[PDB]
Design an enzyme around this catalytic site. Structure first.
Site, PDB file in Angstrom:
ATOM      1  N   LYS A  65      -0.434  -9.380 -20.913  1.00 25.51           N
ATOM      2  CA  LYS A  65       0.167 -10.420 -21.746  1.00 25.51           C
ATOM      3  C   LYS A  65      -0.829 -11.071 -22.695  1.00 25.51           C
ATOM      4  CE  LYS A  65       3.881 -11.615 -18.437  1.00 25.51           C
ATOM      5  NZ  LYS A  65       3.735 -10.489 -17.441  1.00 25.51           N
ATOM      6  N   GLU A 270      -3.468 -18.876 -20.660  1.00 31.62           N
ATOM      7  CA  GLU A 270      -3.207 -20.259 -20.223  1.00 31.62           C
ATOM      8  C   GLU A 270      -4.510 -21.012 -20.151  1.00 31.62           C
ATOM      9  OE1 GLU A 270      -0.818 -20.023 -16.599  1.00 31.62           O
ATOM     10  OE2 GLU A 270       0.332 -18.312 -17.510  1.00 31.62           O
ATOM     11  N   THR A 314      -4.091 -14.455 -14.571  1.00 31.02           N
ATOM     12  CA  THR A 314      -3.989 -13.570 -13.413  1.00 31.02           C
ATOM     13  C   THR A 314      -2.898 -12.515 -13.657  1.00 31.02           C
ATOM     14  OG1 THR A 314      -4.077 -13.540 -10.968  1.00 31.02           O
ATOM     15  CG2 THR A 314      -2.203 -14.778 -12.025  1.00 31.02           C
ATOM     16  N   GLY A 315      -3.046 -11.351 -13.030  1.00 28.39           N
ATOM     17  CA  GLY A 315      -2.064 -10.297 -13.185  1.00 28.39           C
ATOM     18  C   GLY A 315      -2.129  -9.330 -12.028  1.00 28.39           C
ATOM     19  N   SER A 316      -0.962  -8.805 -11.674  1.00 33.50           N
ATOM     20  CA  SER A 316      -0.813  -7.934 -10.559  1.00 33.50           C
ATOM     21  C   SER A 316       0.204  -6.851 -10.882  1.00 33.50           C
ATOM     22  CB  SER A 316      -0.284  -8.728  -9.359  1.00 33.50           C
ATOM     23  OG  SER A 316      -1.177  -9.741  -8.947  1.00 33.50           O
TER      24      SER A 316
HETATM   25  B1  ZXQ Z   1       2.485 -10.324 -13.809  1.00 31.33           B
HETATM   26  O1  ZXQ Z   1       1.400  -9.441 -13.250  1.00 31.33           O
HETATM   27  O2  ZXQ Z   1       2.287 -11.690 -13.593  1.00 31.33           O
HETATM   28  C1  ZXQ Z   1       2.266 -12.230 -12.276  1.00 31.33           C
HETATM   29  C2  ZXQ Z   1       1.520 -13.571 -12.321  1.00 31.33           C
HETATM   30  C3  ZXQ Z   1       1.335 -14.275 -10.978  1.00 31.33           C
HETATM   31  O3  ZXQ Z   1       1.003 -13.529 -10.011  1.00 31.33           O
HETATM   32  O4  ZXQ Z   1       1.479 -15.552 -10.884  1.00 31.33           O
HETATM   33  C4  ZXQ Z   1       3.691 -12.376 -11.729  1.00 31.33           C
HETATM   34  C5  ZXQ Z   1       4.830 -11.824 -12.208  1.00 31.33           C
HETATM   35  C6  ZXQ Z   1       4.987 -10.911 -13.415  1.00 31.33           C
HETATM   36  C7  ZXQ Z   1       3.959  -9.771 -13.618  1.00 31.33           C
HETATM   37  N1  ZXQ Z   1       4.068  -8.907 -12.424  1.00 31.33           N
HETATM   38  C8  ZXQ Z   1       5.039  -8.039 -12.321  1.00 31.33           C
HETATM   39  O5  ZXQ Z   1       5.890  -7.808 -13.194  1.00 31.33           O
HETATM   40  C9  ZXQ Z   1       5.112  -7.246 -11.027  1.00 31.33           C
HETATM   41  C10 ZXQ Z   1       5.018  -5.769 -11.319  1.00 31.33           C
HETATM   42  C11 ZXQ Z   1       4.992  -5.025 -12.484  1.00 31.33           C
HETATM   43  C12 ZXQ Z   1       4.879  -3.649 -12.234  1.00 31.33           C
HETATM   44  C13 ZXQ Z   1       4.826  -3.318 -10.884  1.00 31.33           C
HETATM   45  S1  ZXQ Z   1       4.927  -4.746  -9.933  1.00 31.33           S
END
Ligand code: ZXQ
Ligand code: CL
EC number: 3.5.2.6
Length: 359
Positions: A65, A270, A314-316
């Site tokens: 993002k 952010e 953060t990202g997952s």
């Molecule tokens: B992204 O990675 O952002 C997270 C941020 C947090 O952990 O607070 C949360 C939700 C949206 C995004 N993650 C996903 O869309 C999960 C997945 C995408 C592909 C496989 S799982």
């Protein structure tokens, strides 16, 4: 703080973290005194016994993002879009009357009025995508409530590149990645690079991300620790970025559009005001805050980048967990890439602790 001392602080924070959170492998960069410093730990692929290296590709998840935010900023700086424009300016087929008053700004910053976290799995083509957004009934008026969402910023990134006539991957490569020499950062991993691609891990099972609609814009980028350090460096010190529109796009992405409690929403990025205590940042990262619909206080006109900021994301994905934070005033920053998704508070605590050693 010497190179040797820095290596010790990193090792002494990351090693216990990996043990406690059952993380197979991590790649870390600390940005300090004008350059990156790299630390690699454990395994990229357990079954194959391949170590993490500075070339190992990790799934960024939602740190993708930040690229979306900067590419959109670059489009703004080229004069191709405006954040004040109606979303419908870039999607005339979106005829539902509920979209009136919803700006590109709102899509980019999760304030459209309740667009959900995900694009529904039944959305497999343009027809279904259009139907999804046509049928969406906002729970809140625009500009009133922040709800963190792939369906929001994902659509912003798709619409941001339309006036250019370029598809999203092409636009990203030409306008963001190539100018910054991020030549090992991929929305789609080419065949020749596949051997660098780590496996993600969850409850002991190897996993990688699967396709979804608007994935590239919301959570689909893969990269190594060198490119990510250089990405962080460019966002931390955009004065050194040469291309004029890209430099402005970076500034736009770290501009403050809304205040939500102790944080401020940029484009992807952010921000909290620096100095900030660890507990403030840690508390905010908890899912009960981070996923909640929360009232906003408008920052109009948007405030340009504040150098005294903790800037982060953060990202997952299913099998990966990454975190980046930087403080432009101090010219310090950190990248933590891991091949398991462990709790976000734990990412924040470790990142804060390492960066505190540099102050
Ligand atoms: B992204 O990675 O952002 C997270 C941020 C947090 O952990 O607070 C949360 C939700 C949206 C995004 N993650 C996903 O869309 C999960 C997945 C995408 C592909 C496989 S799982
Ligand atoms: Cl257009």
């Amino acid at each position: 703080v010497s190179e040797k001392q820095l290596a010790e602080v990193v090792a002494n924070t990351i090693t216990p973290l990996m043990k406690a959170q059952s993380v197979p492998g991590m790649a870390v960069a600390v940005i300090y005194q004008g350059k990156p410093h790299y630390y690699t730990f454990g395994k990229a692929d357990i079954a194959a016994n391949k170590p993490v290296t500075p070339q190992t590709l990790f799934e960024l998840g939602s740190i993708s993002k930040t690229f979306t935010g900067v590419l959109g900023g670059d489009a703004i700086a080229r004069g191709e879009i405006s954040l004040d424009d109606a979303v419908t300016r870039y999607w005339p087929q979106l005829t539902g009357k509920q979209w009136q008053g919803i700006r590109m700004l709102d899509l980019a910053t999760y304030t459209a009025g309740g667009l959900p976290l995900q694009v529904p799995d039944e959305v497999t083509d343009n027809a279904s995508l259009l139907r999804f957004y046509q049928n969406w009934q906002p729970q809140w008026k625009p500009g009133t409530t922040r709800l963190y969402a792939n369906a929001s910023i994902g659509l912003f990134g798709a619409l941001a590149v339309k006036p250019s006539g370029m598809p999203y991957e092409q636009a990203m490569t030409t306008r963001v990645l190539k100018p910054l020499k991020l030549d090992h950062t991929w929305i789609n991993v080419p065949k020749a690079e596949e051997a660098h691609y780590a496996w993600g891990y969850r409850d002991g099972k190897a996993v990688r991300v699967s396709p979804g609609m608007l994935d590239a814009q919301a959570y689909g980028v893969k990269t190594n620790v060198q490119d990510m350090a250089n990405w962080v460096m460019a966002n931390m010190a955009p004065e050194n970025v040469a291309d004029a529109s890209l430099k402005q796009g970076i500034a736009l992405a770290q501009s403050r559009y809304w205040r939500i409690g102790s944080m401020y929403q940029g484009l992807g990025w952010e921000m909290l005001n620096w100095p900030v205590e660890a507990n403030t940042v840690v508390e905010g990262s908890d899912s009960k805050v981070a996923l909640a619909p929360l009232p906003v206080a408008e920052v109009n006109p948007p405030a340009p980048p504040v150098k005294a900021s903790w800037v982060h994301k953060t990202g997952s994905t299913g099998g990966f967990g990454s975190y980046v934070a930087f403080i432009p005033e101090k010219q310090i920053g950190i990248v933590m890439l891991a091949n398991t998704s462990y709790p976000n508070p734990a990412r924040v605590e470790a990142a804060y602790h390492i960066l505190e050693a540099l102050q």
